Write a protein that binds this ligand. Structure first.
Ligand SMILES: NC(=O)c1ccc[n+]([C@@H]2O[C@H](COP(=O)([O-])OP(=O)(O)OC[C@H]3O[C@@H](n4cnc5c(N)ncnc54)[C@H](OP(=O)(O)O)[C@@H]3O)[C@@H](O)[C@H]2O)c1
Ligand SMILES: NC(=O)c1ccc[n+]([C@@H]2O[C@H](COP(=O)([O-])OP(=O)(O)OC[C@H]3O[C@@H](n4cnc5c(N)ncnc54)[C@H](OP(=O)(O)O)[C@@H]3O)[C@@H](O)[C@H]2O)c1
Ligand SMILES: NC(=O)c1ccc[n+]([C@@H]2O[C@H](COP(=O)([O-])OP(=O)(O)OC[C@H]3O[C@@H](n4cnc5c(N)ncnc54)[C@H](OP(=O)(O)O)[C@@H]3O)[C@@H](O)[C@H]2O)c1
Ligand SMILES: NC(=O)c1ccc[n+]([C@@H]2O[C@H](COP(=O)([O-])OP(=O)(O)OC[C@H]3O[C@@H](n4cnc5c(N)ncnc54)[C@H](OP(=O)(O)O)[C@@H]3O)[C@@H](O)[C@H]2O)c1
Ligand SMILES: C[C@H](O)[C@H](O)[C@H]1CNc2nc(N)[nH]c(=O)c2N1
Ligand SMILES: C[C@H](O)[C@H](O)[C@H]1CNc2nc(N)[nH]c(=O)c2N1
Ligand SMILES: C[C@H](O)[C@H](O)[C@H]1CNc2nc(N)[nH]c(=O)c2N1
Ligand SMILES: C[C@H](O)[C@H](O)[C@H]1CNc2nc(N)[nH]c(=O)c2N1
Lengths: 256, 257, 266, 267
């Protein structure tokens, strides 16, 4: 049986490493992207060349706004992502909510606050919520005998949000909501055997900071984070649910 | 000097107790409300009868949506207008208590009812408090240092039990999680202005059963049992506390199924 | 109608401030001390001059070791502290586990060093508070309900910063973690007796300054709120509040009093 | 061939941890206190599958002095780590799994020896011994020339996912696990320069002891949201093995719950 993984923001960096890792374990991967069409398509080509029909790409703005084709809502866009997996392969075993906007929203210095609120909250929290809902709906609608044996949802949280990055309030708030989603979905979906966990990087694949990380005095590589994601999705982690695992080299143990 | 407190959702229950307690300590109180006009106005009459010009009421839907003029009005604007009402009337705003909150189910397992739920639950519990804190801070920043108050305090009403989620209340739980994040982020960012930001998280308070599950007293709490903690955090005796959430839950979060 | 408070390590700094604040609220205070007899006795004199028979002092090494009189165990010494309140005033309403040893135990005539550090650091910060709470609770349980006080409150002095460990203080950090557990465990088990158990965790308070000024100033400057360590009152007022009847629904919780220091990262 | 030292390795989780590390290629030093027969049988099985891949060492990890000047807990702990170096010339992984667990009620409704031994036993096995073991483990790595050091040092502390929602009447045990969490963070920070990772794994309900009426047993496991059952030993041990693998080399100072969502419940 070939399981299917939907990974949002899979075009590069961590999402790509997650997609690659899942692919190496035998998963067919649906690579979501927003603006990185070229990178998403190149990654799909590479995976499909290794194993035919093992990758596809889907475009979607995960910001909490309506888009043009009656306007299309974020929920619809989200359901369409999950549906794309079912239409193409007939299944969706894993969902990795990785796509994320990250930029300042200083409390102390228009409609710029409007798009920021919708973009930061949508990608990091509201979209994951709808995606999880669509994912669960498809599992519930599948007759028990036909269901997969290892449903796993991973939310990409942030090991450092409890020690907030100055000026990033909305982003920090959204990761906070993502943690809540992880616990609430883990509890509510347990009866369907759908595990919901979080993985929270500290500093990874930086585009100074490095020297502050206790372990190795550097930010992590993409694999150092993605291997943890892959492990949580494996059958060896079947009793883990509702938990967030930090992958930060001891950074959250530091103080100013 | 008579300090001013803005309390959202002040018409009844915890909010009213918070408004009353602050009032008893000498604060002039701006009582925010959404649909409880009668209650808000009655509370205002009581406080003003006790001490003239010590209370006012301001209406606002804190849901993350555009309303119609009384161009559409955004939640930010409505939030800035709440803080501005304090400055216009009394020339100051020392304390902000983000208490207003919608709470109802959003089950993952069973269309336009989803969009209003998202905007309502997230707006009242998280987005509105963000904009309110922003407006509050901007007013403080724009005040010349020599004229600023000596005890700025913002309290976010969180929830002691959200880490042990109520089945079927996902959006609400997520919003409180966001509110916790706002508490920490605002406490860090606003420290230079000496604006403290803390949280108070009830377990079971003034239930309209679960009661017997509370380790301490085997009952839900009274409004005062929660409001007194809020008032204390607002006091100069709590001036070194910031970015922390205090549970007022009688040990309920220490339980397991 | 005068309540009694037992405060360990009450001779100076935070403990003194806690004892003074409880005294100002009308409590009679049993001031525990280990090595600071002179300071403890002076504090007692002050309090008793303000209000006769409102203060006493008891000496006790709270390290997890047997002392000389069969040898006396820590538990016995602990029970003896609580008993001292009952013998003198017939009651014990509040217990503040404040006494605490704090020095390095780096991981990277010597057997005596590691052996006494473990007992001292763990005893003062965790084992003694455990036995003191046990003693305190037994006295409440053995009191007929009609005579019991209406506001029993135990406060454990934790540390807002132990989750971001101070390099080289492992045993101390371990003991404070044990103290957090004691707070939650005692809060749950003692709820039926209406004995509230809470923690107060300072960040940097009345910071010891045996170091260059730039270094000392470097440390306080890291605190987001005020860029300074706190005063003793800034911590003690929170303790006093948690002990008051207005905090009677709060139990099993640890309150940070750190000016946002725990929100920082390197 | 890397070496793992696993305390309380004779049965249950420790056995499974020892077996899993063994299946990954580790030589395993199986520590035990009272389960000699079980430890030796486990060693026999491992050595039969791969010669010289297992040894056993006995030690009371309670915070008391033993019979030889009396022997201290620290010495006993240093001796465990040393036994790995003496036999195989290395110690790459340490799993602090041994743990005593029994009630210490605050209220009652010979005597002194039980209180004194409970404190030392519960605290020693769950916290003080792990401390001394980590210290011994670290001293050995520091004394090894960088050129001879292993490339994946990993320490795992077996914590408890449910201690924050205390088991009524288990105060000392709960206190010791809290200390263990502290040790995990403190050691992770201090040993980071030597590339020694220190993490925790905290079970919820695992291979639940069933010395009670079946319905009471069904009742407890049914409180667990995922699967409505306690976990298998492998379900916990596989997570330990994963954290010890090179795939987890950027993870340190973190405690991972393996509780099927139990800590998410409320009464
Ligand atoms: N790297 C780190 O040090 C770090 C630290 C802590 C947490 N994290 C978390 O780990 C995850 C991955 O980190 P990363 O650094 O790889 O992320 P990233 O490079 O910052 O962004 C990942 C992808 O998110 C997508 N995205 C952004 N806004 C979107 C929107 N409005 N709608 C749909 N997609 C959107 C983008 O896709 P397109 O390019 O196609 O437009 C982007 O490529 C994120 O959730 C992040 O919060 C990362
Ligand atoms: N009581 C508890 O057991 C409990 C437990 C945990 C946490 N809390 C938290 O403590 C706080 C107070 O609790 P409570 O029980 O007193 O609250 P509540 O009775 O449920 O509601 C408080 C007020 O919030 C206002 N509100 C709701 N939706 C709004 C919106 N869309 N826009 C503007 N205002 C809105 C309402 O004002 P109007 O009536 O004027 O329309 C309502 O009166 C809340 O934040 C709650 O989350 C309470
Ligand atoms: N100050 C801070 O920045 C800070 C930060 C975090 C937490 N805290 C916590 O707050 C509490 C009070 O802080 P502090 O700075 O005021 O404490 P402190 O000055 O360091 O010491 C408090 C007292 O504890 C007593 N003590 C130490 N070891 C003892 C033992 N073996 N047996 C009996 N008594 C012992 C000593 O009494 P004698 O002098 O009579 O011998 C000492 O005066 C402590 O629990 C501390 O851990 C303080
Ligand atoms: N099973 C669970 O549901 C559960 C839940 C939460 C956490 N945990 C943690 O996971 C770990 C393993 O759990 P488990 O249930 O497998 O443990 P266990 O069966 O209860 O005991 C493991 C071993 O610890 C050793 N031990 C006890 N006291 C000792 C002492 N004084 N000195 C030296 N060794 C001592 C014993 O070895 P000998 O038999 O040779 O004497 C015992 O077999 C423990 O740390 C436990 O706290 C388990
Ligand atoms: C620089 C920053 O602190 C850190 O490396 C993280 C924070 N969270 C992130 N989140 C997103 N979406 N993208 C990033 O690059 C990061 N970087
Ligand atoms: C009913 C629930 O158990 C609990 O009593 C709290 C949770 N959060 C709440 N939040 C709001 N806004 N209103 C409420 O009545 C409650 N009730
Ligand atoms: C020095 C350190 O950073 C911090 O201020 C605290 C930690 N805990 C303490 N605990 C005790 N007993 N005494 C102290 O002075 C302190 N100092
Ligand atoms: C019985 C309890 O609920 C839980 O399953 C755990 C707690 N910690 C434990 N610790 C040890 N050492 N052994 C055990 O069997 C357990 N069981």
């Amino acid at each position: 049986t070939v399981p299917v993984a939907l990974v949002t923001g899979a075009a590069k960096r961590l999402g790509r490493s997650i997609a690659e890792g899942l692919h190496a374990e035998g998963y067919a991967v649906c690579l979501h992207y927003h603006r990185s069409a070229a990178e998403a398509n190149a990654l799909s080509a590479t995976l499909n060349a290794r194993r035919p029909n093992s990758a596809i790409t889907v475009q979607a703005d995960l910001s909490n706004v309506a888009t043009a084709p009656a306007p299309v809502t974020l929920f619809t866009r989200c359901a369409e992502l999950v549906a794309a997996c079912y239409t193409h392969w007939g299944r969706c075993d894993v969902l990795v909510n990785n796509a994320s906007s990250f930029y300042p929203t200083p409390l102390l210095r228009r409609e710029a606050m409007e798009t920021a609120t919708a973009d930061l909250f949508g990608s990091n929290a509201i979209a994951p919520y709808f995606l999880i809902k669509a994912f669960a709906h498809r599992v519930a609608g599948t007759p028990a005998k036909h269901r997969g044996t290892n449903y796993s949802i991973i939310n990409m949280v942030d090991a450092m949000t409890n020690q907030p990055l100055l000026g990033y309030t909305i982003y920090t708030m959204a990761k906070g909501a993502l943690e809540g989603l992880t616990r609430s979905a883990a509890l509510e979906l347990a009866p369907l055997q759908i595990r919901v966990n979080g993985v929270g990087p500290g500093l990874s694949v930086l585009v100074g900071h490095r020297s502050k990380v206790p372990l190795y005095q550097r930010d992590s590589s993409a694999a150092e984070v993605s291997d943890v994601v892959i492990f949580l999705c494996s059958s060896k982690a079947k009793y883990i649910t509702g938990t967030c695992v930090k992958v930060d080299g001891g950074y959250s143990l530091t103080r100013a």
